[PDB]
Design an enzyme around this catalytic site. Structure first.
Site, mmCIF file in Angstrom:
data_model
loop_
_atom_site.group_PDB
_atom_site.id
_atom_site.type_symbol
_atom_site.label_atom_id
_atom_site.label_comp_id
_atom_site.label_asym_id
_atom_site.label_seq_id
_atom_site.Cartn_x
_atom_site.Cartn_y
_atom_site.Cartn_z
ATOM 1 N N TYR A 229 8.964 58.931 -9.036
ATOM 2 C CA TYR A 229 7.944 58.456 -8.132
ATOM 3 C C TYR A 229 6.557 58.494 -8.728
ATOM 4 O O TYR A 229 5.752 57.606 -8.458
ATOM 5 C CB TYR A 229 7.978 59.282 -6.793
ATOM 6 C CG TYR A 229 8.995 58.817 -5.790
ATOM 7 C CD1 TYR A 229 10.339 58.706 -6.112
ATOM 8 C CD2 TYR A 229 8.649 58.503 -4.476
ATOM 9 C CE1 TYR A 229 11.255 58.234 -5.229
ATOM 10 C CE2 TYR A 229 9.584 58.043 -3.575
ATOM 11 C CZ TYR A 229 10.915 57.975 -3.940
ATOM 12 O OH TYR A 229 11.843 57.464 -3.095
ATOM 13 N N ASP B 26 15.840 61.031 -1.650
ATOM 14 C CA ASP B 26 15.524 59.925 -0.823
ATOM 15 C C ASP B 26 16.754 59.251 -0.378
ATOM 16 O O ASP B 26 16.961 58.890 0.813
ATOM 17 C CB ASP B 26 14.596 58.935 -1.578
ATOM 18 C CG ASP B 26 14.356 57.695 -0.802
ATOM 19 O OD1 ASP B 26 13.696 57.852 0.231
ATOM 20 O OD2 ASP B 26 14.758 56.560 -1.284
ATOM 21 N N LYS C 205 22.233 63.489 -11.860
ATOM 22 C CA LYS C 205 23.015 62.609 -12.718
ATOM 23 C C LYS C 205 22.988 63.149 -14.148
ATOM 24 O O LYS C 205 22.525 62.482 -15.074
ATOM 25 C CB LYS C 205 22.544 61.159 -12.671
ATOM 26 C CG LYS C 205 23.584 60.202 -13.210
ATOM 27 C CD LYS C 205 24.791 59.924 -12.272
ATOM 28 C CE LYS C 205 25.717 59.020 -13.054
ATOM 29 N NZ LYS C 205 26.891 58.617 -12.364
ATOM 30 N N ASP D 147 18.716 59.949 3.692
ATOM 31 C CA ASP D 147 19.041 58.805 4.580
ATOM 32 C C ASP D 147 20.534 58.720 4.941
ATOM 33 O O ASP D 147 20.916 58.490 6.133
ATOM 34 C CB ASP D 147 18.488 57.504 3.932
ATOM 35 C CG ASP D 147 17.108 57.110 4.476
ATOM 36 O OD1 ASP D 147 16.481 57.910 5.166
ATOM 37 O OD2 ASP D 147 16.711 55.982 4.215
ATOM 38 N N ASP E 209 26.342 59.852 -7.278
ATOM 39 C CA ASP E 209 27.346 58.859 -6.802
ATOM 40 C C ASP E 209 28.504 59.542 -6.058
ATOM 41 O O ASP E 209 28.873 59.133 -4.941
ATOM 42 C CB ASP E 209 27.797 57.951 -7.955
ATOM 43 C CG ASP E 209 28.408 58.694 -9.145
ATOM 44 O OD1 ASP E 209 28.032 59.853 -9.375
ATOM 45 O OD2 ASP E 209 29.144 58.037 -9.935
HETATM 46 C C1 LIG Z 1 8.619 54.344 2.078
HETATM 47 C C2 LIG Z 1 9.144 55.147 0.887
HETATM 48 C C3 LIG Z 1 8.096 55.274 -0.134
HETATM 49 C C4 LIG Z 1 9.649 56.558 1.219
HETATM 50 C C5 LIG Z 1 10.181 57.217 -0.030
HETATM 51 O O1 LIG Z 1 10.823 56.554 -0.842
HETATM 52 O O2 LIG Z 1 9.972 58.463 -0.192
HETATM 53 C C6 LIG Z 1 10.664 56.557 2.308
HETATM 54 O O3 LIG Z 1 11.875 55.908 1.907
HETATM 55 C C7 LIG Z 1 10.949 57.970 2.699
HETATM 56 O O4 LIG Z 1 12.099 58.444 2.581
HETATM 57 O O5 LIG Z 1 10.074 58.678 3.249
HETATM 58 C C1 LIG Z 2 30.592 58.945 -15.828
HETATM 59 C C2 LIG Z 2 29.333 58.126 -15.543
HETATM 60 C C3 LIG Z 2 28.552 57.960 -16.776
HETATM 61 C C4 LIG Z 2 29.577 56.731 -14.951
HETATM 62 C C5 LIG Z 2 28.257 56.055 -14.674
HETATM 63 O O1 LIG Z 2 27.318 56.712 -14.227
HETATM 64 O O2 LIG Z 2 28.162 54.803 -14.886
HETATM 65 C C6 LIG Z 2 30.433 56.773 -13.733
HETATM 66 O O3 LIG Z 2 29.779 57.433 -12.645
HETATM 67 C C7 LIG Z 2 30.781 55.373 -13.345
HETATM 68 O O4 LIG Z 2 30.436 54.916 -12.234
HETATM 69 O O5 LIG Z 2 31.511 54.662 -14.073
HETATM 70 MG MG LIG Z 3 13.622 57.086 2.080
HETATM 71 MG MG LIG Z 4 29.608 56.289 -10.876
#
Ligand SMILES: CC(C)[C@H](C(=O)O)[C@@H](O)C(=O)O
Ligand SMILES: CC(C)[C@H](C(=O)O)[C@@H](O)C(=O)O
Ligand SMILES: [Mg+2]
Ligand SMILES: [Mg+2]
Lengths: 364, 364
Positions: free
Chosen positions: A143, A249, A193, A253, A225
């Site tokens: 950010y 973030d 990650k 959510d 992920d």
């Molecule tokens: C609007 C955006 C900049 C903000 C962020 O990414 O932090 C929002 O998604 C949040 O979660 O408060």
């Molecule tokens: C293991 C990792 C590097 C890989 C990625 O982040 O692309 C995996 O999560 C994927 O989705 O294939």
């Molecule tokens: Mg957000």
């Molecule tokens: Mg992945």
């Protein structure tokens, strides 16, 4: 002594739910003999209309003179097509965070008794219930990393953002997560990650360093992920999630949506000296603004976090929290909380605030 | 002429499900008179054990001599505690992607008839069903941006990753998404963080440039945090999602989990000249390896993508796909696809491959 609050209601439903938060606050002020002064400042879309930018100089000054910011919601269709660096949501929130060094973002999300049916989770998963606190590092990472920008022209024009963290940054947010877990179910899941990112390698290393001070809290690490997957399938197995700025973030959510009741969720963005910004988790919802149907509970509970975290008024915070519980279990629900067959029982925004304020007053 | 395939089965369930993919492939080879030669190479954990690294020089050479890589799964507990840059999953996958310029990652995820109950979605949402293709940029962004690394010592030690995209990179992945949507429900949802990130501002700009060549496909843009929420609530309203490398990593997983049947999902990682790597969407699942219970369908369908995308054998690809449909609707399901009351009907990995191969042979 006399607390000072900068009220930044912003756009859409922000002013109408803020009206209810202030109402509930007045009840708590009278109950607990708090002396709180409020000043309203424009922020977001309203600030762009009244002042030409989403965070006016007088608005920022106002926040510098206050003990806390009580923040509504910003953004709407009217400003969608400004350039990104003039847009109201980012233009209000990131500079407030950066300016006040609000490194700590707390977003708890719990599935409430009797509202399982609103969760988009399969009924057996929602029945297990869940309570997941997202702790998100808010002033670092990608950010605010530099360099940020773009260079070049045509096909070879490139843009770039730099995710960076120092050990100092990671350990301060980690401590927040562990200390939170200590008072909850004693588990931190750190989300990163580290298989791809150098910032994540350092993150996972430092969180494990911080862990030594919390032999009582379990620490596990998960990639972002995989965390999106697991929160969907078994959200009951997470307690506190510890995340960098971009990852928190995203995860905060997802978890909020899994409750199916985002109008009940609030957030706290805190610096290390007890100043913070307290806002609902959900957006400015321009489609319902001014109608008397917005759920004010998120804003009301933001005011409760303000009282606890910035004002050191834990009994007043807790009183608001219990007044909200009483509404939710006494048939005071807004329309989005009700199944479509029970919709006709919906309370308006004002009915909600009046009920909640009255419960505080009655000594809930 | 005679196709050459580099078989990289890897770790955990990888070899056992690959055995089934090769079995089904043999049926298609005989049906359609394809002349395909396969060579096996170690990758991942097995490569570390046999050769000292997750991507041996001979393994990479082997892939350079092939028309496609048919890839299993890599990783496991045995290698968890190596340093990140020696670990098998990242150590196999990122260098293959970078080396072969596999910029295009395709991960379709559909909720299958009769398997709604396995979706972790609320029953009404799973009943609506969904079919979402994630198109993810795989060789750029923060995965491969420089500078990457760390500097400094102690509290001030810092690590850093640079997310970068050029217009050329964004437009090539965008075209893939739009062209995919054209053949599906004619909607691309581009997913970014343009409110915060300079790479995302450029991404959203270039995707809108590419859109001019597709007046027939609707384009909308969504931020990654909001997309995690919406995929949970209304996954039926998305067709193709177009994502950068980190964002598509996150979103593709979330969508896969929403099916509740990841053993049915496969992926295609393609360069611009038709070479690719074809793998199941889910992991090496070390906990079930060698038992005869792993679902081979993801690996079998990977082989079908290999035939379509790299080998230009669309009828053979489609034959495998229909053989899988026939299993799924003729009571040939592995255990993880069945409710716990119907578990006792579970087929083993071999039973699955034999059924699927037999259907190809019978002219499905
Ligand atoms: C609007 C955006 C900049 C903000 C962020 O990414 O932090 C929002 O998604 C949040 O979660 O408060
Ligand atoms: C293991 C990792 C590097 C890989 C990625 O982040 O692309 C995996 O999560 C994927 O989705 O294939
Ligand atoms: Mg957000
Ligand atoms: Mg992945």
């Amino acid at each position: 002594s006399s607390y000072q609050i900068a009220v930044l209601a912003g756009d859409g439903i922000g002013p109408e739910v803020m009206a209810e938060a202030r109402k509930v606050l007045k009840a708590v002020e009278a109950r607990f003999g708090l002396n709180i002064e409020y000043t309203e400042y424009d922020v977001g879309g309203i600030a762009i209309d009244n002042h030409g930018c989403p965070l006016p100089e007088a608005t920022l000054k106002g926040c510098e003179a206050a003990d806390a910011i009580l923040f509504g919601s910003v953004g709407g269709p009217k400003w969608e097509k400004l350039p990104p660096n003039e847009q109201p949501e980012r233009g209000a929130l990131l500079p407030l965070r950066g300016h006040f060094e609000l490194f700590c973002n707390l977003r708890p999300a719990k599935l409430h008794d009797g509202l399982e049916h609103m969760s988009p989770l399969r009924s057996d998963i929602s029945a297990r219930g869940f309570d997941v606190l997202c702790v998100r590092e808010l002033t670092g990472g990608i950010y605010f990393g530099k360099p940020k920008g773009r260079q070049g022209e045509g096909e070879s024009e490139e843009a770039f953002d730099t995710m960076r963290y120092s050990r100092r940054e990671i350990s301060r947010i980690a401590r927040i997560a562990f200390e939170a877990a200590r008072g909850r179910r004693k588990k931190v899941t750190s989300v990163d990650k580290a298989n791809v990112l150098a910032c994540s390698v350092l993150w996972r290393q430092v969180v494990e360093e911080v862990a030594v001070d919390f032999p009582d809290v379990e620490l596990e690490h998960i990639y972002i992920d995989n965390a999106t997957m697991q929160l969907l399938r078994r959200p009951d197995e997470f307690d506190v999630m510890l995340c960098s700025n971009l990852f928190g973030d995203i995860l905060s959510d997802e978890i909020a949506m899994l409750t199916g009741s985002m109008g009940l969720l609030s957030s706290a963005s805190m610096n290390s000296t007890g100043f913070g910004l307290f806002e609902p988790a959900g957006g400015s919802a321009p489609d319902i603004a001014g109608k008397g149907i917005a759920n004010p509970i998120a804003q009301i509970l933001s005011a409760a976090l303000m009282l606890r975290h910035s004002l050191k008024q834990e009994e007043a915070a807790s009183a608001i929290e219990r007044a909200v519980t009483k509404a939710l279990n006494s048939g005071y629900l807004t329309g989005e909380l009700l199944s479509s067959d029970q919709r006709h029982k919906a309370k308006t925004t004002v009915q909600m605030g009046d009920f909640i304020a009255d419960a505080v007053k009655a000594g809930v």
